[PDB]
């Protein structure tokens, strides 16, 4: 199941922008609640939980399968933090969101659930696809005729496509080439506290 | 009862390092001589020697200290002792200070350092963890 309640509540309580263009946040950064002014006592667990929640709702990932993320990252021989960030950025949802074919990660998930795309010529209608390397992601004719996808493809003029990701032309073919690196990704927050909380 | 000459020698070395001595006198033995071989070639004892005494041959140990008075050997603990004896396989050779230390291993060739044993693939009994 996904989140059906308000989405701006998340940013308001979290104290940082999630989508990026929040007028309501900039109008009132204080987290909701009749006591959004009470001073918050320092707590290492508190901050670890804060970081965990922010990352989880930022990526739309469910709690259990993101624990699965963390354990899988431990399993891989590389460093746990960058392994986790790699495996969570590999999400087809994040791929479409950051390739300019989805305005928001939630909309990418909605479209994938609708099943309007072809991956390597095989129909797929699952959000959490594992986008390997060298792969190719397509979009099919009914998706093309769909209006909002057209708008997104002409609106992909935001923060430019990251290094390993790129779009080749009007058909919007997305292909990944090399290994994303933490420094170039510059995904926000620090994996230190996430790994600490899950190693608790 | 001098029921562990190796332990007594190592205790004398560390105690002399603590008391800031220069020479330590001990009864001489073949095991003492070869262990001195090991430590001197590793560079922990400035130099040993074997002399003659009233009854039996002995040995004197010459240590070094770091240029700023620094102690040469920080800690000394025996591992394989009468009663509790410890051995190791070719793969499970002990690691001391992540390689920064030297563990004295008895292998077929004799007593060689941890790196020598690891490169040769041979193993045996680890004598003392010297740091």
């Amino acid at each position: 199941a996904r989140y059906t309640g308000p989405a701006t509540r998340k940013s308001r309580r979290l104290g940082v922008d999630l989508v990026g263009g929040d007028q309501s946040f900039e109008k009132r950064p204080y987290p909701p609640g009749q006591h959004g002014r009470a001073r918050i006592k320092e707590s290492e667990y508190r901050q670890q939980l804060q970081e965990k929640q922010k990352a989880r709702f930022s990526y739309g990932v469910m709690e259990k399968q993101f624990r699965r993320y963390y354990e899988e990252a431990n399993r891989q021989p590389g460093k746990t933090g960058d392994n986790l960030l790699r495996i969570l950025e590999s999400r087809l949802d994040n791929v479409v969101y950051r390739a300019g074919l989805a305005r928001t990660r939630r909309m990418a998930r909605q479209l994938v659930s609708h099943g309007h795309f072809l991956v390597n010529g095989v129909k797929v209608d699952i959000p959490s696809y594992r986008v390997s390397q060298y792969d190719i992601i397509d979009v099919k004719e009914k998706s093309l005729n769909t209006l909002p996808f057209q708008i997104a493809r002409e609106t992909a003029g935001e923060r430019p496509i990251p290094s390993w990701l790129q779009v080749v032309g009007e058909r919007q073919r997305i292909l990944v080439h090399q290994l994303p690196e933490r420094a170039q990704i510059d995904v926000p927050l620090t994996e230190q506290l996430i790994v600490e909380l899950y190693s608790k | 009862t001098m029921t562990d000459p190796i332990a007594d020698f190592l205790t004398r070395l560390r105690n002399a390092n603590s008391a800031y001595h220069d020479e330590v006198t001990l009864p001489h033995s073949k095991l003492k001589a070869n262990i001195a071989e090991i430590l001197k070639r590793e560079g922990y004892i400035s130099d040993y020697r074997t002399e003659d005494a009233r009854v039996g041959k002995s040995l004197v140990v010459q240590l070094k200290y770091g240029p700023s008075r620094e102690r040469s050997i920080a800690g000394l603990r025996r591992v394989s002792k009468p009663g509790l004896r410890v051995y190791a396989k070719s793969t499970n050779l002990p690691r001391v200070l992540g390689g920064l230390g030297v563990a004295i291993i008895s292998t077929s060739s004799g007593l060689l350092t941890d790196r020598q044993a690891a490169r040769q693939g041979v193993g045996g009994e680890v004598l003392a963890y010297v740091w």
Partner: protein, 180 residues
Amino acid sequence: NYIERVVSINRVSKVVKGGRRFSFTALVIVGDGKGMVGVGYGKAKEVPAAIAKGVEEARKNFFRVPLIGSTITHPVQGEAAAGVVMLRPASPGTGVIAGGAARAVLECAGVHDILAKSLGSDNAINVVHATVAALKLLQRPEEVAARRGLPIEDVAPAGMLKARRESEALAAAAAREGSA
């Protein structure tokens, strides 16, 4: 840029003829992020003064711990004060794992991969004392070779030799990036 982390604000009281007099004492650690550790514990009559004295004490009492890459060199048996603490360098991304005071001091020092496990009498002050003692008990391979009259290749394993080489290259790249 320096780091200050509140670890333990405590309430104390003293008794004289009229009754009980309450008091405050606090402990705080300061570090630069490259391996400089500073602790300060002080008493005061209220939280702001206590923190001020703690920061002053931390600035006064400093220390420098040579780190390798982004992790400690070898495992440290931190025995002192009343607690027992052991440390183990870690691989990257794993983080610096320990208890409260241990993490306070370590994140102040700036490390990012280490393992620690408090082994009895975890009182924060004694724990921090033991962490500092262990941290100062570390050894630098270059100085070890210098003392033993032995050279770097023969003293230090090839693994950490390559690790130090890569760390040096990364530091040079960072310096070039900053200067440019």
